[PDB]
Design a protein around this ligand. Structure first.
Ligand code: 6AM
Ligand code: 6AM
Ligand code: ZN
Ligand code: ZN
Lengths: 154, 155
């Protein structure tokens, strides 16, 4: 179950990835949602550690209680890299939903002959065993493929 | 693979881990050294749960060094980088890493003490950052770190 409600928040992550692409950044966006369904924070890509998932981790730590964090959900256009996955787990954030996996992205970068990142594309549960993780979203594969192609294709 | 010069900087990381323990933090310390041998920055734990000295060094190196100087710099650390720090180091393009104890030793020790496993897996650095040159652990500092980790996480 990627629910219909989840898809609504993933589509929004996708629009943030587009917004970042248009302002000259890498196409990645994420959205922190509280247990209620209220969007608490939103971000997108922008130094090389400026990942929206990490920004969300630092934000959740600064502005939420351990208890509220644990009940929050993070949606993301692209599965967290190991930095973000670890940060999320260290601050005690809850569920993660992603539209594309770092497996799909790594496959695609290889297809385009693009430089592999200096960080391995580990699935989240390899880095953070306790986190509940849903995705990818079959509905948004082609869109993300196209978005990633705009930035990284070659 | 661990030189005498490396050990001097690891001993210094250990004293920072001590300093952190004494001021009520987790016993972790790290030291950023430039290609010359000049210490550029030093830090230790401050738990915000992401306040890891290795990460602080990554953000610092990005803010204050050139891609070229970063690549030629060495980071020493009392305890092998967690996946967050290991990834951050690789994303900013830092150089060699030397550690006094591994996350394997630490994870073994926490299990021995019946202590709660961390919410992040103890991945070796090269699992997270394949390209980084990594030296350690240091047999000379095992018992010391064991004792120090025991103070915070066993006792
Ligand atoms: N997973 C990820 N990878 C990169 N390069 N940039 C961001 O923002 N996230
Ligand atoms: N790797 C690591 N793990 C913990 N708990 N605390 C710090 O500072 N570093
Ligand atoms: Zn990331
Ligand atoms: Zn760390």
């Amino acid at each position: 179950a990627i629910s219909d409600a989840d898809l609504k928040y993933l589509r929004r992550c996708v629009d943030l990835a587009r917004e970042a692409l248009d302002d000259g950044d890498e196409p990645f966006g994420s959205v922190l949602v509280d247990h209620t369904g209220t969007t608490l924070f939103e971000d997108r890509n922008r130094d090389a550690t400026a990942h929206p998932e990490f920004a969300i981790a630092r934000w959740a730590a600064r502005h939420l209680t351990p208890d509220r964090r644990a009940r929050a959900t993070v949606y993301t256009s692209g599965e967290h890299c190991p930095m973000c996955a670890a940060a999320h787990a260290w601050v005690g954030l809850g569920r993660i939903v992603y539209a594309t996996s770092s497996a799909q992205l790594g496959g695609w970068l290889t297809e385009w002959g693009a430089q592999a990142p200096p960080v391995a594309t580990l699935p989240i549960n390899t880095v953070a065993p306790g986190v509940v993780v849903d995705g990818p979203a079959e509905e948004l594969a082609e869109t993300m493929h196209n978005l990633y192609r705009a930035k990284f294709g070659r």
